[PDB]
Each structure stands twice: as structure tokens, then as C-alpha cells.
């Protein structure tokens, strides 16, 4: 079709499983974009459809904290998803690099994420795979803008209707309700936001074990705490939000909207 007509590729930015992301420019506009190139030829049509579903969802979502999709193109043997360019690498990488975030930075960061989650939810979309690996930083500076990525596992809900949408996500960040093979919805993303905030503050996750069966027994039982010395200095407000995010029953758990009104996010 018309991709190698309008854009021109430069350096590789990352490999995925089936994919390769590369900085590209729209040659008429002179506009930098990130281009995720996928192999049609290595993929059944069932999986062509799985991809055109990802693009459909990404284009309902115009938001300052969500990597916007500008175009989506089928050529012979390749597919091109044109995202906003984000040069500051994964949130994960920058957390490792800085060991942990200050409450002030962690708040500014989780706030932006919650905003993104809220917009997803009010547009009838649940991400089901929130983790710092799927959050790109605008730059590597200390209070940087964070946009949300990969809706490869994102689903469509009708209103607050819960349902069994299958067993999917990342084991660290899975909801009790999903492991328990109960029906679920928007709250699964707020559970993940719980995990991500915790990581953000002290540099490790509230649930971990090398043996996955134990990791799951941990999550189901709401088995997190705030160890010493490092959590002793951290405000009780910060703790409170995490406690309302890692509430084990999903109906008593805090919503994206409730979360954005919490003192620890909206103070002064």
C-alpha cells in the first residue's frame, strides 16, 4: 500500500516477540514518530485480527498520558503501527536506575497513570496488563511525563458489567479475582496500580516468589506488608492508598476516580 510512500525508517528502538520498533519520520510533515513493524508472513489471519483489534482500541484513546496511535497500515508481509515517539525508555528501567522514587516524584508519576487508567475505564477499556514495562517516559528527567502503552491484552466492557474475559496479564500484577477464575472488570487495573505504586516507592514488588504457585498463593491472600528500615520513613497516607488499591475484594477496592481524589495525590 502507502507506508514506504509517506514515512522513512531510522534506528531500531527495541525488539518484541514478533516485532521491531524503529524511529520513523512522515516525509511530507517532517514529523518524528515511533513505528512498530510486525511480520504478517510469520502470522496466521487469526493473529492478523488480534493485531487490528489492538489498533482499533488504541485509536479510541486520545489522552496526554496514553501513547496515541496516528496511523495503522497493512503492506505485503508487514504491518506498521505509528505511535507517538517517546525517547525516555520504560518506567521499569528508570526505577531500577534510581533504586526507588521520592514520594513527591512517585505521586506525580502514579497520578498521571491513574489519569490514563480513568480515561481507559470511562471509554469502556480495561488494560489487564499494567506494569512499569508498559509505561514509557517522555524523558529520563526527574518529574517526566509518563504515557501508557501495549493494549495487546486490552478488552471492552459494557458499563460496570463484570465477566470472565479469560486468564491474561503478567503474574506479578494479576488481580486476586483473575487467579480465583472469578468474573472481573475495571478493578483489575486498580489492583495493578497498587503493585506499581509500591514498586515506585521502595524498588521491589509487594508480592514475589521464584516458584509461581507461591507467588499466586501470596496475591490471593493479600500478603503484602511495609518492611523496615525503608518503609518506616514513608508517610502513612502513601501506605493508605496502596492498602485501598490492594484491597483483596474488588468491589471495596478504590476506583481510578476515587484514587485521583485521595489526599496523597491532591494536597496543598
Amino acid at each position: 500500500t502507502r507506508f514506504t510512500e509517506e514515512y522513512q525508517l531510522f534506528e531500531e528502538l527495541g525488539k518484541g516477540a514478533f516485532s521491531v520498533v524503529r524511529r520513523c519520520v512522515k516525509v511530507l510533515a517532517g514529523q518524528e514518530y515511533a513505528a512498530k513493524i510486525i511480520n504478517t508472513k510469520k502470522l496466521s489471519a487469526r493473529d492478523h485480527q488480534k493485531l487490528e483489534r489492538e489498533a482499533r482500541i488504541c485509536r479510541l484513546l486520545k489522552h496526554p498520558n496514553i501513547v496515541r496511535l496516528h496511523d495503522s497500515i497493512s503492506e505485503e508481509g508487514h504491518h506498521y503501527l505509528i505511535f507517538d515517539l517517546v525517547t525516555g525508555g520504560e518506567l521499569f528501567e528508570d526505577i531500577v536506575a534510581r533504586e526507588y522514587y521520592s514520594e513527591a516524584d512517585a505521586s506525580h508519576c502514579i497520578q498521571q497513570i491513574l489519569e490514563a487508567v480513568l480515561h481507559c475505564h470511562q471509554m469502556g477499556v480495561v488494560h489487564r496488563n499494567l506494569k512499569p514495562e508498559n509505561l514509557l517516559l517522555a524523558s529520563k528527567l526527574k518529574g517526566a511525563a509518563v504515557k501508557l502503552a501495549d493494549f495487546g491484552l486490552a478488552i471492552e466492557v459494557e458499563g460496570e458489567q463484570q465477566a470472565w474475559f479469560g486468564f491474561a496479564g503478567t503474574p506479578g500484577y494479576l488481580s486476586p479475582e483473575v487467579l480465583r477464575k472469578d468474573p472481573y472488570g475495571k478493578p483489575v487495573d486498580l489492583w495493578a496500580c497498587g503493585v506499581i505504586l509500591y514498586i515506585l516507592l521502595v524498588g521491589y514488588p509487594p508480592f514475589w516468589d521464584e516458584d509461581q504457585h507461591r507467588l499466586y498463593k501470596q496475591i490471593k491472600a493479600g500478603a503484602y506488608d511495609f518492611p523496615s528500615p525503608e518503609w518506616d520513613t514513608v508517610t502513612p497516607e502513601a501506605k493508605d492508598l496502596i492498602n485501598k488499591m490492594l484491597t483483596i475484594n474488588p468491589s471495596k477496592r478504590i476506583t481510578a476516580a476515587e484514587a485521583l481524589k485521595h489526599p496523597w495525590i491532591s494536597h496543598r
Binding site: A168, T170, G203, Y204, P205, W208
Partner: peptide, 19 residues
């Protein structure tokens, strides 16, 4: 195996594939 120290627990943080 991690110790009862902040420096130790920070090794529990690795990237994770999906499923």
C-alpha cells in the same frame, strides 16, 4: 533467597513476560 534488607529486596524487581 533475599535477606531482611532493603538492598536485598530490590533484587526481587525483574521484568516479567505475560501469561
Amino acid at each position: 533467597r533475599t535477606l531482611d534488607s532493603h538492598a536485598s529486596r530490590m533484587t526481587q524487581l525483574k521484568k516479567q513476560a505475560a501469561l
